[PDB]
Amino acid sequence: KLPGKFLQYTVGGSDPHPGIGHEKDIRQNAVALLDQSRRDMFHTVTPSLVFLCLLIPGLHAAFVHGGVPRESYLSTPVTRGEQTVVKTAKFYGEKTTQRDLTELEISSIFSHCCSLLIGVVIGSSSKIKAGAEQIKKRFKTMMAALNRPSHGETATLLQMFNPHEAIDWINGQPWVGSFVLSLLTTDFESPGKEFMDQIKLVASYAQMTTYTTIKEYLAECMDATLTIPVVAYEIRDFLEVSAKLKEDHADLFPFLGAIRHPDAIKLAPRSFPNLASAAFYWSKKENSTIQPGASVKETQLARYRRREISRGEDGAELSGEISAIMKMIGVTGLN
């Protein structure tokens, strides 16, 4: 037999970290890090954080308050001075040929940051590494709203720099929820307004998939699984807990997941295990599902799924007008 010993955690350790540099250097740092060979010199996350600081004045100080270092680790240490340097708070080169950003560079930074912040609001980098045509559509919509629709296709100067590492890094920080809350509740001047319009659409019910799946089930299910007593008693509790949270949080209710609010857990599957089981079962059949703590069984869900419920009748006859419209498409009536 193995003895049952296991590797134990040590205490502390310095690991490499990204940084944000100095506030006075944001623009010069951002311009320098538009170049891949410059990005290669630093921790991969650093340029994404610098770009965010450029995008949103005031964010640099917020990051500093959250404990984000000014210094970024270097990709390779340098022995410049008999001393070994592993990090620096400046990212632009000795060759300080300061230029300004171009319009297309700005749109490209917006593209990078749009993907980055979508990942932060949804709490995952998996889609940005992959499920990305929907992200491009959001960016195109933003660029159209800013009267620059061509940039939806052409603002590709950072296309090779995927923000996935920075999504993960931000998602692991204790202040991520506060960061999201600030983005969602700040009234930004254009073009920030248009930028955040897209982030707000994505953030709505983000990380509240149990809640939205149950809501879909309660609206759309046409079978008797809804009537299984342990499910039904949880339906009443779910609607009441939801109502209490809606009253308490008002316009922030759809953002509870995105802001990592502790109340979001009140709408997790463990809170309504039988109802979540039934809704997940329905959802997978319409497109295991049995949750920890549920007493309902798959065999019961199967049997009740075969029985129909009613959501009211609406008339056994079409109006003459609707009958005529139906004739246009080859429909003769109700069956």
192 binds a second copy (CB under 8 A): yes
Of residues 244-283, those binding a second copy (CB under 8 A): none
Among 224, 241, 252, 268, binds a second copy (CB under 8 A): 224
Q: Positive or negative, the Cα torsion across 62, 191, 21, 35? A: positive
Among 78, 85, 265, 309, binds a second copy (CB under 8 A): 309
Of residues 24-83, those binding a second copy (CB under 8 A): 54-59, 62
Please identify, among the stretches 63-71, 85-93, 270-278, 307-315, the one whose residues bind a second copy according to the rule CB under 8 A.
307-315
11 binds a second copy (CB under 8 A): yes
Q: How far is the CB of 154 from a second copy (least distance, A)?
A: 4
187 binds a second copy (CB under 8 A): yes
Q: How far is the CB of 80 from a second copy (least distance, A)?
A: 20
Q: How far is the CB of 307 from a second copy (least distance, A)?
A: 7
Q: Which two tokens stand for residue 162?
A: 């995927």
Q: Based on CB atoms, which residue is closest to a second copy, 85 or 159? A: 159
Q: How far is the CB of 229 from a second copy (least distance, A)?
A: 7
User: Is residue 200 within 8 Å of 83, Cβ to Cβ?
Assistant: no
User: Is residue 150 within 8 Å of 107, Cβ to Cβ?
Assistant: no
Among 213, 216, 249, 252, binds a second copy (CB under 8 A): 216
* Amino acid code (one letter) for 85: V
DSSP state of 271: G
1 binds a second copy (CB under 8 A): yes
User: Is residue 91 within 8 Å of 21, Cβ to Cβ?
Assistant: yes
Question: What is the per-residue DSSP string for 198-232?
Answer: HHHHHHTTTT-HHHHHHHHHHHH--BGGGGSHHHH
Q: Based on CB atoms, which residue is closest to a second copy, 150 or 248? A: 150
95 binds a second copy (CB under 8 A): no
DSSP state of 206: T
Of residues 148-177, those binding a second copy (CB under 8 A): 150-154, 156-157, 165, 168-169, 171-174
Among 122, 180, 221, 296, binds a second copy (CB under 8 A): 221
Of residues 131-150, those binding a second copy (CB under 8 A): 132-133, 136, 150
DSSP state of 73: E
101 binds a second copy (CB under 8 A): yes
Count of residues binding a second copy (CB under 8 A)? Answer: 107
* Amino acid code (one letter) for 293: G
Q: How far is the CB of 126 from a second copy (least distance, A)?
A: 5
Residue with structure tokens 């039904």?
232
Q: How far is the CB of 182 from a second copy (least distance, A)?
A: 5
Q: How far is CA 16 from CA 70, 156, 268, 320, in A?
A: 13, 29, 35, 74
Q: Name, in order, each residue with C-beta under 8 angstroms of 318's C-beta and a sequence gap of 6 or more.
A: 326, 333, 334
98: three-class secondary structure by DSSP: coil
CB atoms within 10 A of CB 310: 6
100 binds a second copy (CB under 8 A): yes
Task: Tell me phi and psi for residue 95, to 5 degrees.
Answer: -65, 90
